[model samples]
Target: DPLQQTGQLFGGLVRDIRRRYPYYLSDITDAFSPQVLAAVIFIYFAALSPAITFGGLLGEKTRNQMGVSELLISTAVQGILFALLGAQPLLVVGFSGPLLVFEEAFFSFCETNGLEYIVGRVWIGFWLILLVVLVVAFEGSFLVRFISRYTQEIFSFLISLIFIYETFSKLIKIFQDHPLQKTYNYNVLMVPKPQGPLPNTALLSLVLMAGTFFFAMMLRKFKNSSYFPGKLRRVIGDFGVPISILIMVLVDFFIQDTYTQKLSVPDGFKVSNSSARGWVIHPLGLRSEFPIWMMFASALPALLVFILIFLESQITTLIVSKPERKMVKGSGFHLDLLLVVGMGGVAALFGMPWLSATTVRSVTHANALTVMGKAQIQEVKEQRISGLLVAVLVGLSILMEPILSRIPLAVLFGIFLYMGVTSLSGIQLFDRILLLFKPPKYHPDVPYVKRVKTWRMHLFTGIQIICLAVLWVVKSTPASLALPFVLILTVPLRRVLLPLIFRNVELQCLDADDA
Candidate 1:
């Protein structure tokens, strides 16, 4: 009788999901307009190109078994499937730093434990899926309600911060590595001498980078400026980021014969180091049944992995589900976790790394498809284009070898910088930092920013800064795989610890989406 009631509960939940699902038929029809096509094309390279490159680099950086070709194929397959069948269509799945760090730690753990690398991964994979399934079976998606706005802001802010860091870090490194005026010979203490000529072609790089930034910036800002009509403004804002990229690419072509590194798309779309083995794989390479003791040993670590995937996925959902985003669809946390587990198993067998819903790419995809009105986002259009673009990338993998090779790295850097700058707009944490010094007349009309005592506002912002700094340190440390835990801890710290420091009204106003 108890079992029968449990089965009925799960069955009803499944039925509710099916009934509520946003069918693709309507989405596909909305997907065909010129504006939608523009969004897809812009996001394809601006977001997806860097995503693929990042995926490949993570494999090499972590010494993981997978590489670029594997990533391309994996993304192509997973992206299409997830969009078509996923509960929340807004989620754009891709490689992430948490999983990248986890894979490296896992490899080291396997080596120390004397388990075959593939075998150990396979063992963990099944365990991960099982734990995820139990959580879903018991209605874990319901828990997203307790995730405060404070938590969501920190998470979203962190992702935007990472993109910003990555862009300028690469740009600055290129100049440092290729300084024309610098002399380099190991001398006094083995470090290169600082003496060198002035950077020979510094102006060329600066021109392209700044050109892309200002071009995109002007185009985006003119939406609010009097220079353009609404229709023209929408078109310019939608296409500006990518158009600047194309123009700078041409500028970079004649600028230098020997310049900074270009994107390393290999000769063919095989695995970064593929040889005899083809891309497709079946049944992860475990020789026999997994040992019982190993399961006990791995439970804590596996739980952390689940937390990494689930927390990131749900927080991104919360951010996207904000009222100002003009979204009508409901979030399906259970269905998303199920899809992630299935995809994870497939990746394990194929030796591709696991992926989660990447915040930047997903948010960027959602924002790109939106139609802007004066005060609020007027509408968020279809997501079927997300699937179609990724599907197209599979074909390009075969053809993109020479086609993608021509673009200069600095141009891509400029595009990344543009993405970073645009993503930072309206983030209240950054806005709050400026709010502290501004008179009330100047304070931005953000949610929950009451006309509070000046000192208390600083205290609230100061507390968040400490949490973020801790997250940054964890994210940058040798044990950076543990970064996700620190992120999750923010929820408890917000709910429990922050209540003592700030008023209930301040917490509600500052953190929740609808508040």
Candidate 2:
């Protein structure tokens, strides 16, 4: 019985491919519509900006052995391959925050210990692939059944908050750069120094950011506005984000003297480091630097990386394919990890940053494709064209650096703010948090409102908020390496602890799958 169960490792993967196989042609045909184009433009910038930022940061931490070029190529390759053969095409895959922190810390450890970074990374990559495959072979992704709405909401809410927090913090950094006059006068009886006119760079950056967010919000809602025809409104709503970004870019040009920051794409496709390291990382060549023993020692860190990848990847898959999305096509939990196997293998050979599902980007992909019909959910154009197109464009962007470099970082921050705020739309946790402030008499007519007492509802929400704060604090501290472990704990807390506090009926109403 055990052997037979283990023999069915590829069962889920086969199910996913077979389910999606019939619609493969339509996935391409449907992409020719205007909706696909809008999504492509919206997701391209959404995915690209983060890739470059994470790549740049990873470059700083790894002494430039890996950076923008590697990240871009990895995304393009992984994106294209997954869209063609994987399930859940709407879930955009790329570099994620947890992976960035992992790479940063691991590389730091390698440097201090005098172990070669790439050599250690390659060994870790191999072990990571092996571990992930083992987990998949035993049908590990099926464990996601234990994950419920409580933990899902908490994790999703934390990521949304991170996006919003980063936007404000980035702007604050600009203000810090252009601080107010703080010089002291002479000790003896001396005249005070005249303060010069302050630079408007910080103020302008804030305005541009606000401008992008405002325009994006406005255009996104244009479909419901009475002024526009139904077709025209749909087009505008589809292209809302792209239009908003372009509007802000033009505004920045009008006030070029502000000298706001621009995107820093590399001059061409190559290594970020100036050293003579070739494109390919030779795992054996670095043996002269790190002993053969280091290879086995790499497994420990590899295991940590594997956990982070499994949780991030599977949780994102669950979020992307949640029942609320009403996806008619099938999902592939086991199959998804297999794609990552190919992704990790490729990145390892090139000394590139490995990517997984980034929450906001993937969510944006789904939202971008969603078609609202007369104040209700209608349909989501589940197709692969947008994902494929976005990847190709990202790959081509390497040659278009001259144009891409002109986009202001402030405008991107504005997009970030818009994305963060917009993503909170359907999250039940966010809805309940707002309920706490509203008068109970005006509570919305949802199932939880009627079935659960207001006080009990508030108590449940309070516990979740505390968990959210704890997770955020954990990520902000040096213990972020344990973030996946902390994230996984939320499930048990919901299953084991919450049952002791609330009746089963109340818990069912409060934590329904599609609430």
Candidate 3:
């Protein structure tokens, strides 16, 4: 199994990380490039919304919407150490939705039990770290192994959809907030319709979003075009998003002098101090109202969190390490999982939100830094750019607040929208969706589809859809804490049910990663 790399549980991890430190340290000097600087700005904004959004989430659960400061600190320190020491430095760490539910539950549970939320939550984190250690002690590779391509397709597709949905949904809400207004020309031409005053936010926002996305798309295409020298094209594609953002910023700046409508960003770093922990989750928030034996009891639910982290992190590592990615270093499932648990444990002590490898964020980060050929990614040139820039931004948060506030919300929303669209191209399930419409003769040489009945192929895809739907429903509901189990059910569905539904060969072709 992948987890059995040494004599003891963490012994291998300690040795492996130490051996790799010099290489990573050496890699850093070479990692610096213009692309890395672009990544800094790109990831900084990418993290901003989520950090603020999740800050609201944890704050709503406990005391305060801790602002961008907490998100920056936790992820910055955790990310730098994880990249230097952990296996998958390309994996972008963040506060995830499922764990948010668990964290909130733990908070409510502690409050009801008359214990301090921060201290009691740290207890659960203890059990989670221990559970992860035990999983490493034994072989937990089966968790990664048992998940076939069908399951990955489902999970990956779901992640892509989530980003797309979040992006477009935000875009729609922006339009919703500021409705379109039109005036008739009539005799005098272009009066305010004699009814009301409107901010013309509709057109400006459209330009801000649509123009940015279109520019990024064109710049990305330039990388693969014969229109420019390779070096120049590569530069254009690598910094496309930043360039698009900059162009839009200039446009907004010119318009700002004349227009009164604006995007509002918080002018500075501030946190509501109900819990009174400044820049850290204070240990003083603890109240010792429970028996010491209760620590053992909390481990029961912490096991779920452990499983959740392993599934997401392992699967992400698998996706990022896929052959199409042309990643030569391969994945470190056990090592990285250990790093996540270690990061989680430390964050608990400081009362920072627990973070994990975000699937879409990692994929987006990798894709941003990837070079593509005819079909798959030819290679990922520098995973370090995405890894290093984020931590740099975290360090800059206080001084950067005024600059961050100046950017229009539409530009941020547009970039997210563009990322969602870009991410869609990598989803195999969406590719499957197109296959459902294409005649088998025209089917684009996907592994299983070429050999099997179109119906069997659709059946495999159909099952995945059903599974994705179920996971989506659970994720949206209060049962989100159990999301790991929802995802794992796909394995049993493939192992047990697929055998009954399709031939063995069909199952192999359908589920095997290579196929």
Candidate 4:
């Protein structure tokens, strides 16, 4: 009876791959449209900006154990391969914050234990593959079905805040970073640190940042404007992100003499660390450096990463598959998991950052391909080509260092600000939060507003706000390494505790996904 209730080994994975096989030709055929190219350009820059941004910060945190080259390499290779073989081509693969936290924590462990970081990571990847296989073998991915919109909204909101918070923090630092100590007449004053204070480069950076975000936002709104025909509006809207980047970068160019911080990448393809090291790392060579018994012990840490991967991968697919995305083909949780597993092993061997479904980028990918029809319904141009091309461009970014290095860091932060705002557009949680400000008479006639009492609605919103605040607090504490664990707890908090606080009918009205 127990065996009958459980799925057969690889049953889910086989079905997922088989279900998507018939659409392979259509996936390629669909890519021939003009929007495909637009999607490619938008996603390519969107994906790469984060790679460059995270790569530098991660390199600093891990002491170059993983850096820009590794991030881009994994993004390029995994994305290309997944686009070719994955069941869900809409999902973008890249470095992530949670994984960054895990790696930083793991690196600290390696330093304290006198073990090589890459060597220990090799074992972590080894155990990670097995753990993932175990998950897929038991049909573990099916569990994502229970993750309701309540948790998804919180998770998504947290990621949006992260994007905004990071950009805001960096912008504040531009002002906080005291300029160089300079003497004017008899008084000592501060000028721009490396460059002279002639241009007020800090002010220029702030303007560039705000300009980029504003331009992108306005161009995207051009889709709904009366100035253009529908088709032309759609074109401009789809290309908005890239156009914004170019306009701001061009502005920065005229003031090029000003010493604003620019995008950083290595001059050539090599390991990011100062010390010379080869591309491939051999775990076998590290046997003496790392204790043999500890190899098995590494599974404990690998399990933690596995939880992060499984939840993130499956939930992202769920988000992408929502009815609003208009994905006609289908999805592939099990197969994508396998793809992630294979890439994780290879990335570790190459001393690169691991690749998984990044929440913001994946949502941006689906949104980039969306088209508004005559009926005003949104439909995504689901195809493998855009993802494939984007990855290829990220891979080729190394050769374009001369051009990429010229773009100001402020411009990219603007893109981050735009992305965070856009991603928060559809979540109903934010909708309820806004309701907290308006009187009941001014509330929109949505189902929840019509059915739930004002006091009850605010109570639900208040609970979510507290949960989100707790997540941020935990992330800042020493227990930050357990952020993934804290994220998972929200599910039970929703499933079990919320029921005690609110009736079933009230929850149905307040928490159900929008039709």
1 or 2, which is superior by TM-score?
A: 2
- Writing each residue's lDDT as its tens digit, candidate 1 over 396-437 gives 654676656666666666666766666655466777777778
Off by over 4 Å in 2: 1-7, 180-198, 274-276, 287-289
C-alpha lDDT (0 to 100) for residue 213 of candidate 4: 96
lDDT of 2 by residue, 77-100 (tens): 888888887777876878887888
1-515 per-residue lDDT for model 3 (tens digits): 24344566556555545544546654576456666666666776776667666765666567753434566567778777776767777788877777777777877776687776666556677787777777766646545766777777788788777777776776666556555656522233224222323355556777887888888888878867788777788788788889999998778778852232333233355544534554455443533444675567778767777777778888887877776676655566767888887688777776676788888778777776676665456656544556866866664665665666557767777788777777667667777888988888888786677777899889878887888899889878878877788888888888888899789987777666653
TM-score per candidate, chains pooled: 0.87, 0.93, 0.87, 0.93
Q: In candidate 4, what are the lDDT values of residues 346-371, reduced to their tens digit?
A: 78988887778878888888877777
- Relative to the unseen true structure, what is the C-alpha lDDT of residue 26 in candidate 4, on a scale of 0 to 100? 90
What TM-score does candidate 1 get on C-alpha atoms?
0.87
lDDT of each: 0.67, 0.80, 0.70, 0.81
